[model samples]
Target: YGCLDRIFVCTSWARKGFCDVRQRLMKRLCPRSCDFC
Candidate 1:
């Protein structure tokens, strides 16, 4: 369970990483953030 928590956090980090990368592109970029629940 503890390890899964770590994985979940890591996954969130990866999603942010992807958005950051997208923001660097000129053609299409992700917003600084998305509205989420």
Candidate 2:
């Protein structure tokens, strides 16, 4: 998966309430340092 695809997936997930914005965004954009539910 590439950058744009990850962004789109995260955005869609957030929009559908599948996951929280903070965690989802961080998991995709900065996985090495972010930790949240």
Candidate 3:
């Protein structure tokens, strides 16, 4: 698998801390930005 953002807005959301608050969604949609990958 590749470490990349599935959504263009992933970076924006990650910067806002969505990766911690919305783990379910952010982890899947923004894995790269969220550092899940």
- Give the candidate number with the greatest TM-score: 3
| Model 2 misplacement above 4 A | 1-21, 35-37
The residue pairs in collision within model 1 are none
Every model's TM-score:
0.24, 0.32, 0.67
Off by over 4 Å in 3: none
Candidate 3 per-residue lDDT over residues 1-37, each given as its tens digit: 6656667887688778888888678776778888877
Q: What value of lDDT does candidate 2 attain over all alpha carbons?
A: 0.44
lDDT of each model, Cα atoms only? 0.31, 0.44, 0.77
Which window of 10 residues has the lowest lDDT sum in candidate 2? Answer: 1-10
Q: Output the number of the lDDT-best candidate.
A: 3
Return the candidate ranking by lDDT, descending: 3, 2, 1
Tens digits of lDDT, candidate 1, 1-37: 1111212233354366643443343112222232111
Candidate 1 vs candidate 3, TM-score winner: 3
**31 Cα displacement, candidate 3 (Å):** 0.2
lDDT of 2 at 9: 50
